[PDB]
Amino acid sequence: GSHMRVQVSGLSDETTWHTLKDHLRQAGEVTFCKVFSGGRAVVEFVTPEDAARAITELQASELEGATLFLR
């Protein structure tokens, strides 16, 4: 499922998983969304297309005042 997986960095201190999930629903359906230390998270989407759309169209987007980096 690596093709469906996106690594997120740059989250604000206050941002939790469901908020990130809602942000990324702009790109597609989210099947895994967990927040980790240092403003980071790992997300998986239903399809590789959704992951591609997130990286393509949501790169450096602001969430709760913080710019996200996607890879």
Residue numbers in the entry: 199 to 269
Verbatim from the authors:
Kinetoplastid RNA (kRNA) editing takes place in the mitochondria of kinetoplastid protists and creates translatable mRNAs by uridine insertion/deletion. TbRGG2 is a 330 residue protein and contains two main domains, an N-terminal glycine (Gly)-rich region composed of GWG and RG repeats and a C-terminal RNA recognition motif (RRM). Unlike these editing accessory proteins, the T. bruceiRGG2 (TbRGG2) protein is required for editing all nine pan-edited mRNAs. TbRGG2 binds RNA and modulates RNA structure and these functionalities have been shown to be to be essential for its role in kRNA editing.
However, TbRGG2 does not contain the signature aromatic residues within its predicted RRM RNA binding motifs, raising the possibility that it may not adopt a canonical RRM fold. To address this question we determined crystal structures of the domain, which encompasses residues 203 to 269, from the T. brucei protein. Two apo RRM structures were obtained, one of the RRM(L209M) mutant, which was constructed to aid in crystallographic phasing and one of the WT RRM. Both structures were solved to 1.8 Å to final Rwork/Rfree values of 15.1%/18.7% and 16.5%/19.7%, respectively. The WT RRM structure contains four subunits in the crystallographic asymmetric unit (ASU) and the RRM(L209M) structure contains one. The RRM molecules in the two structures are essentially identical; the Cα atoms of the RRM in both structures can be superimposed with root mean square deviations (rmsds) of 0.4–0.6 Å. The structure shows that the TbRGG2 RRM indeed harbors the characteristic RRM fold composed of a five-stranded anti-parallel β-sheet surrounded by two α-helices (36–37). The TbRGG2 RRM structures revealed no interfaces significant enough to provide stable oligomerization, suggesting the domain itself does not oligomerize. Although the TbRGG2 RRM adopts an RRM fold, as noted it does not contain the conserved aromatic residues located on the RNP motifs, characteristic of canonical RRM proteins. Instead it harbors valine, arginine and glutamine residues in these positions.
